[model samples]
Target: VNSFSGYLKLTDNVYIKNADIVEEAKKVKPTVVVNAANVYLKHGGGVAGALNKATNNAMQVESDDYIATNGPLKVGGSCVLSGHNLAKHCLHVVGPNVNKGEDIQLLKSAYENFNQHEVLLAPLLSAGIFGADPIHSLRVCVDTVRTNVYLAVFDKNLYDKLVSSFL
Candidate 1:
């Protein structure tokens, strides 16, 4: 399948890949899959949208329910929801929006919040519409994750860049 390609090992257990998060979630079946979500937990587009679609939109319903009960997730904060057809759980983290002058610290917090999971699958948080530099976000992901993780990168160019820098 063309679901994944290119692998770079950051540590003994942590790795990076140019892969589809939805496919990887099905393949690896990690303890949790991290969603780079907005504060409102809307799975409108990007990785969030793909995941929601893969799960038949159950993910969005859960997200809406979570927001209804607990309010919007603050930047750097995270909450876990049932992983409909993916991993055991889905961790929704509100990454910082660089367009608003948000810094690396908040992005770092997003990764940090999900470290309790032993095996994690996460996208390059804040690097899409949020406007954080891909390289910078990659660095923060590598720096903050304490357990085993797969940093799933959808863009091949960004994947090559990360692999070259870290390999």
Candidate 2:
């Protein structure tokens, strides 16, 4: 019953899906869901904020607790926390901010960190206010994610652009 608009087999294990990640996370309850987080790990807006809302703000409370205990997450670094209403866990990755001169390596690191999980639901890191180009971010995601991943894309045009690259 869960259908996606686009799919790409990146490797024997890795794949991409143009699907609503939060909905899929709620459905499949993957090993972990990913948040395209900032250095501060504040789920105030964007995908982070949306996931926070989806989890009834429990995600934000957890993130805050993590920050309070462990301090801010650096770019390219990630941490895993318990998921509330969705997947069993949430992997928060601090992606590069293009405006801050953090580029490909950090973004790649974010995707690489995602490989720690067997099944993951993720979004395009750094492609929003962080300032990475959508296509560029998609390429990094497709290239570095070694585990089975659902590339949760919500925008129609962005999904088309991502799928078109494979076609």
Candidate 3:
């Protein structure tokens, strides 16, 4: 992967590296940043948790309100949030159950259904708390269309696993 500024270009569309995704999103100035959330939009763990923590746990309130009004979103269902964050908007999607294996298509739908935006920072959906294979999920993301996709792989061990798992 070639590094552009600090963003590593993984392919024509995908960029992967380790960094605070929100901070990185600030660097890219994306229109929206897609982060995983439960059907309840409870931002309690993994990247979602961190995001909630960043705004003094205020994000959860906004997300919760959105869910309460709109009702529980199905897995792969998405919605846009405008609140606290580096990006102009946050796209929250309900990911698959943690134990479910290889939720590739649903992962694709999370991004595929989003409106056009110049840049979008995305985490490896279902990889963290969901426990799906990171490398495999990343491959699914790369195949999808977008202006630019930034994938934050925070764990060094997880990065090593990506290399060993493939090469």
Candidate 4:
């Protein structure tokens, strides 16, 4: 839990705005950065699918922008991605499903709520915690977003289910 011990217990502080761990830190990024941590589902972002970009919102901590756009799901079809975005990437959790007005108002509802919470809680973890890392502090930012003050607004219940398997 302390620095002398090694990597401390980090929160959801995974947002690194400018550089790509796989792209920039090609040498010392997290050991698990290359896996399908951001892979999309069926009819999803194809081979180049699941784009994780750095957001301009991030000041010191940058989040991995997980983008899922123009999906080919047929109504009942859905693309479920993990909260790896929120959990470890300060998730942007973009869904083409919500963008194309596919929602019967429910998707709209989720989007509305999700976006609001996502933004409002944006600075929830701006400050780092005990024994944080200089490189991977973003992951801790997300951790604070998770179990900090039980936020009633930006509750990512759907993302919770989707990301359960991973984190």
Candidate 5:
């Protein structure tokens, strides 16, 4: 099936796996990309670090200020920041520090707390240092979203699973 670019209804307005997130960004140009950030808003690892590096620390800068003004965001809390030129906007959500262990409630709260967007790109939460299964995290992310969903994946195994599961 070559219908990967279009939307599907497996769950929660889902769309999963394009070959590359950046190239996918170039095409869909999502208005918001939900960034997983710590309550402190530090950018050190995972998707946060990548976004920081790409935006020349602009994301961190904006998030830092946001945190300072509003106080450190609690888990599941979120704020919007400038995407620079990377995305039209950035939705920064404070997620559980996965190193402490999987926080399904926290992750769920985080995913369900966001405001609406026509298109939103999100990563598989807790999949990295937090060690939540990528597939499970992806499900939670998709299940929580009510808007257009575009889940971009580069891993062959993930891409294959996503394609076959939906097909």
Candidate 6:
């Protein structure tokens, strides 16, 4: 699986939002995309709760393995994963925070547990990007997918990541 993150520079606090995620992803469509950081919406707007669940729903609908490890997965299992045809989703994994309660390096290293995998770990959400607790949707989005190895991040960079993507 290919790899990608937001921009390296943070001038004007450049960051990568879902729109950027979509753009970069389209350029190199992968079977799965792991997320482990901050997120606020799904599709053009908020789906109400667990935005990553929306991603899982999309994966299941697409018949892909959009795994995750978070709460409030999806309200209706029967709900439509995607309202569009081009939309695709992988497996799901909405579980607890593996990056929490353990050593900082250990928490960050937790990702090493999954190597050669197609991961999308945030700076801290995978464990604790900035805040002490992990974000719900982002965690589930990254864990459910299968992989071998990848990179890591803290929380502070996610916003910058999203911003740099726009400007």
Better of 1 and 5 by lDDT: 1
> In model 3, which regions exceed 4 Å deviation?
1-4, 26-29, 100-104, 163-167
TM-score of each: 0.90, 0.88, 0.83, 0.22, 0.81, 0.32
Summarize candidate 2's per-residue lDDT along 31-149 as a digit string, tens digits: 78888888788888888888899989888888888899999988998999987888788899888988888866778887888888877778888877778888888778767877777
> RMSD in angstroms, all models?
3.1, 2.6, 3.3, 15.3, 3.6, 10.5
Per-residue accuracy of model 1 over 1-167 as CA lDDT, tens digit each:
22333567788666788888998898867678898888998898888888999999999888888889899888998998988889889988888988878766888888888688877788888988888888888778777888777788888887888778773
What residue runs in model 6 are displaced by over 4 Å at the alpha carbon?
Answer: 1-6, 9-23, 37-56, 60-106, 118-124, 127-130, 133-167
Tens-digit lDDT track for model 4 on 67-157?
Answer: 2344332332222333233223222222223223443322222223223232222211111111212122233334333322111111244
Model 1, C-alpha of 18: deviation from truth (Å)? 0.9
- Candidate 4 displacement at residue 159 in angstroms: 23
| Global CA lDDT computed for model 5 | 0.69
Task: List lDDT for all candidates, in order.
Answer: 0.83, 0.79, 0.70, 0.25, 0.69, 0.32
Query: If the candidates were sorted by their lDDT against the true structure, best first, what order would they fall in?
Result: 1, 2, 3, 5, 6, 4
Q: Which ten residues in a row have the lowest lDDT in candidate 2?
A: 1-10
TM-score winner: 1
Clashing pairs in 1: none
TM-score of 6: 0.32
Instruction: State the lDDT of candidate 5 residue by residue for 39-98, as single tens digits.
Output: 888988877887777787888888778877888887777878887766788787776766
The window of 10 residues in a row where model 3 has the poorest summed lDDT is 1-10
> What local lDDT does model 5 show for residue 77?
76
